[PDB]
Amino acid sequence: NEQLAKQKGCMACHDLKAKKVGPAYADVAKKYAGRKDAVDYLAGKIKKGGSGVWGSVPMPPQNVTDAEAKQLAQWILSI
């Protein structure tokens, strides 16, 4: 949920609507919602980070567990 995103520092680089560092959470939801295994995909990206999907700036790996990454993916996709 949003409280968890805040607790894990996600909002430093992601706003719900504005572009900061990574994509707006509302934009991620638009891209992936309804797509097969969107939750599992996004959970992996949240924990491990990555580059090249939204731009050339990498997202670093994050101090989140698998269960946390899944909760955050579920929350994001619900926007």
Could you list the residues known to form a binding site for heme c, using ranges. Answer: 10, 13-14, 59
Nearest to 47 by CA among 10, 6, 2: 10
Asked if residue 14 binds ligand HEC (CB under 6 A), the reply is yes
Per rule CB under 8 A, is residue 55 in the interface with a copy of itself? yes
For position 38 contacting ligand HEC by CB under 6 A, the verdict is: no
Candidates 40, 57, 65, 66: give the one binding ligand HEC (CB under 6 A).
57
Judged by phi (left if over 0) then psi (alpha if -120 to 50, else beta), residue 38 lies in: alpha
Counting contacts by CB under 6 A, is residue 23 touching ligand HEC? yes
